[model samples]
Target: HQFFRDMDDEESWIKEKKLLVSSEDYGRDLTGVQNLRKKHKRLEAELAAHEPAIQGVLDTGKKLSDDNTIGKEEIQQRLAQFVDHWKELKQLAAARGQ
Candidate 1:
């Protein structure tokens, strides 16, 4: 559990930080504004797919006194899926800059 959480947190930070500078670093004007919006829209859509499961963890984390044992197995399963999806998305996004 700790292992998965650590990896998720670390990779999330790295991916987000990379995204933060993505437009500016690539020179936003390098692409037309329309294309930029398209890129943003695509990213938003891709990101939205993970939100529900993620929110489940976040929303539940706050109220629960402990890690969700009942949902722990389910959560771990989804965590694996999320991790794989996140990794793939980051790779695809990174490829855009390359």
Candidate 2:
């Protein structure tokens, strides 16, 4: 639970930071776009190493769900929600690249 919550907390930071920068700090110029994209690239780079860790938890969560050791639906929802946020993060960054 701690590990998953840590993921959520970290993701919260990324999403909020992205939102604020994209909406409030963005400038309508080439360099402005480049700056944001570069930030995203670095952010993604930093997290790239954790891809396996993310998969690890989700797989374990699924197994736990199968064994009925916890709130199966809740576990699945949290897992899926994390994955959704992760996907949205990349989608957002990729969209900004253009």
Candidate 3:
């Protein structure tokens, strides 16, 4: 019974996602569309600027995970900083800014 309920919930979620994607509100508001495009470019630029630093952090984390040299607590603290950065970016990306 629980499995069937979970499947039903997933189906409803997918249907709602499709409906949201098919909406024409963005097209109806030209100014909003332009603003969204500009915001997207700005985000791209910011991400590009941070690309090298992000890559370095990821590489360091991978290396530390493979080796037993770094303490797990230290690795987690460093990675937690990255997680916070990701959450901030996600929040900005989700904002409509209307």
Candidate 4:
């Protein structure tokens, strides 16, 4: 139901996230670096938007597990994977952010 839909939403968002993190432009030049700072602020808001939805995912997933739902472990693993992805994005942001 909504869980499946939200999971789909996050999956799609993760796919799209590649574009921002995969940028070839490293903000090396003075203008580029300045613009990158602006972009960094934008990225913060963009990442934050997904925060609530994922938090909901965790809440729902935990409730499901409380009810002894199947696949709950897989969901938790996916959540861990999501954490790994977040870290990857953060490191790249810091690198480009500098």
Candidate 5:
């Protein structure tokens, strides 16, 4: 019963995720389409800039994926470590107008 219920939940989650990804709204709840596009583009640029570093970390196995070595518990621990440094990193990065 529990297994069936969990499978049903996963199915629903996948359907919802598909809708979300294909949605024209993007971030419609917070801002308009233009603003949403702008924000997404900016975030893409920021992520691209950091992608090399992120890829290097992943390649080194220093930053393991949840799908790979790091399960939920280990990912949570790593997320906590990330959150600790995120504030200072954001502040420093923002100073450069990036």
Candidate 6:
């Protein structure tokens, strides 16, 4: 009877420890997900703020193209900066998805 009691007690303790570990793991996962979401949101806001300026430059580039005016090459070069910025944001967004 004493042996049986000891075994049962050990089984209960083991189960409790497993439960504690599981809960901790879940808490950590939850926190990590929350942090990722926050970072994603902040990044999105930054992109939003930058987009208008980027678009304005591109629009100017477009107007220059249509006008057949001077500085066309310069406008294209300026537009490339926006392209790189967009690519960088997309890469960062993809990373967060993972």
TM-score of each: 0.37, 0.58, 0.42, 0.67, 0.29, 0.49
Sorted by lDDT (best first), the order is 4, 2, 1, 6, 3, 5
Error of 2 at 78 (Å): 2.5
Report lDDT (CA) for all predictions.
Answer: 0.57, 0.65, 0.53, 0.71, 0.45, 0.56
Candidate 2 lDDT, 1-98, residue by residue in tens: 76557657655765665565567446667677677767766656645754675677777666766777566667677667768776776676677655
- lDDT for predicted candidate 3 compared with the true structure: 0.53
lDDT of 1 by residue, 1-98 (tens): 65457547755764674475365435456666656566756666655655554555545544442645675555556556655666776677657645
lDDT digits (tens) for residues 9-79 of candidate 3: 44354345334434423655657677566666565565565556555555655665676544644655645
Q: What is candidate 6's lDDT per residue for 14-89, written digit by digit as tens?
A: 3453344334334466596776676666666655755664565567557667876565766476446546656766
- Expressed as tens digits, the lDDT of each residue in 1-98 for candidate 4 is 56666766786777687676447346668777667777777777766876675677778888978876777777778777666776777677677667
Pairs in steric clash, model 6: none
Badly placed stretches (over 4 Å) of model 5 are 1-31, 62-98
Task: List runs of model 1 lying over 4 Å from the truth.
Answer: 1-30, 59-98
Q: Poorest 10 consecutive residues of model 1 by lDDT?
A: 56-65
Query: lDDT of model 6 at residue 13?
Result: 49
Q: List the lowest-lDDT window of 10 residues for candidate 2.
A: 17-26
Candidate 2 vs 5: which has more lDDT: 2
Q: If candidate 4 were superposed on the true structure by all CA atoms, what would the RMSD be?
A: 3.3
* True lDDT of residue 57, candidate 4: 73
Which ten contiguous residues of candidate 6 have the minimum total lDDT? 1-10
